[PDB]
Ligand binder design. Structure first.
Ligand code: GLU
Ligand code: GLU
Ligand code: BR
Ligand code: BR
Lengths: 262, 262
């Protein structure tokens, strides 16, 4: 069959995908910049396809409704055939691996704690043993599922608190979670992946920090519909780009070369 | 077809696979202990197979002879059908992914530098810009291939030195490389994966240390022959064990609960 345009689903998540400054006057793929935008171009080059970047319609990574069993987010766009590939900071998880294909990981990370500077919190155990400082996670993502499923004493205690906290401690986007840390004068801490935490730590106004070690160890992968013929070539491209040092170069470009806090 | 015993290829590499103290009086799988021995039992349980642990015949991880194109080590045992699965600290690489199947990674790591304490070396750049202190890597492994293929200025310079150094700076086993660091009074440094470096740093006589950051970022995966029906179930088992915290528990058990340097 003749080549067709590969539909790429992704998510507005800094520094992976961001609107360029002049984006209102730009169109198509040129509206966007970031780590995943650069990565998409590299994957397309090595695999030999043309592509269109599209921002996921519901703004979500992907979770399965416990009642209706329907997948939302970027995972849903792959499951229902609305996109051909997802190039995003999409965490490789068991429940997702059962319904979509993943490349080997292009980035390693773990769940981490973001505080406003000066907050008297050093660890998840600290958060779990107090109630003055609220804390939460992103909706429809792997971090929330981590706490929902954990049998580790500290993390189960944190989940029991978060699921019933009022007002809600869950946010719709990472940016909302970060904004809540910044505006809460230290009374809200945010549970997010170390990649995004470390990025924000280097962005103005330089008022947040990552505390403690990571709570787990996992990776982001490029996702394709289960059984898609594109997955094999995409996986080999990730491995080649990793071994050539390109992924390290892109991490340095978007996290630290552009750091704003010194 | 009726179930048959799964032949597991692995390698004597501490703390992944080690001879038990009384091993001369033990037989079968009971001769061995370590992270990979525990992991094998967990994978077998979740996938529902019986298995026999076998130590790779040539003691190697796996490389392809540039002339004869033949694979040695554990990769060769899978390629030629002498083993059904490899449960070992086997690095996921492009050239291996082309000939065998890999699970998603069960451990993350990077290449690192081991010195005898007091050696005046802090980085790969330091090693590359001097000649008093020799340095080398393991034969037939992914670290040697890393330096052989690198186009990064510092690492290419190090390869050009290592490939022609006399006497040879390459070793046959990790243990030989560690012993050479310890006996060379600081005149040999060893390039090895951070996992093994960090383990040795916590073992008697506590005379080595890991210096500098990791040179790359990658992972170990469970390997199966290409197209093997076992790979799918093995991959889901790794992800479940990761998410249940078992891999973290096993890392703590074999690296740090058993640390000997404080
Ligand atoms: N990377 C996560 C989203 C962010 C988070 O959950 O912290 C996912 O794929 O669901
Ligand atoms: N894990 C490596 C062996 C150790 C090394 O090369 O440093 C491999 O799979 O080849
Ligand atoms: Br992973
Ligand atoms: Br990997």
């Amino acid at each position: 069959g003749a080549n067709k345009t590969v539909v790429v689903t992704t998510i507005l998540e800094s520094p992976y995908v961001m609107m360029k400054k002049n984006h209102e006057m730009l169109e198509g793929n040129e509206r966007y910049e970031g780590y995943c935008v650069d990565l998409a171009a590299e994957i397309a080059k090595h695999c030999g396809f043309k592509y269109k970047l599209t921002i996921v319609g519901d703004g979500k990574y992907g979770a399965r409704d416990a009642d209706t069993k329907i997948w939302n987010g970027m995972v849903g766009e792959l499951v229902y055939g609305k996109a051909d590939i997802a190039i995003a900071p999409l965490t490789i998880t068991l429940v997702r691996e059962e319904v979509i294909d993943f490349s080997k990981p292009f980035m390693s990370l773990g769940i981490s704690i973001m505080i406003k500077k000066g907050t008297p919190i050093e660890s998840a155990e600290d958060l779990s043993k107090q109630t003055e400082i609220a804390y939460g996670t992103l909706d429809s993502g792997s971090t929330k599922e981590f706490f929902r499923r954990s049998k580790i004493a500290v993390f189960d205690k944190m989940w029991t608190y978060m699921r019933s906290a009022e007002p809600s401690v869950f946010v719709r986007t990472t940016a909302e979670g970060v904004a809540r840390v910044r505006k809460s004068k230290g009374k809200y801490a945010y549970l997010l992946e170390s990649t995004m935490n470390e990025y924000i730590e280097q962005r103005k106004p330089c008022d947040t920090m990552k505390v403690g070690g990571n709570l787990d160890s996992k990776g982001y992968g490029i996702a394709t519909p289960k059984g898609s013929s594109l997955g094999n070539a995409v996986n080999l491209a990730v491995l080649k780009l990793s071994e050539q040092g390109l992924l390290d170069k892109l991490k340095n470009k978007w996290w630290y070369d552009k750091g704003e806090c010194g």
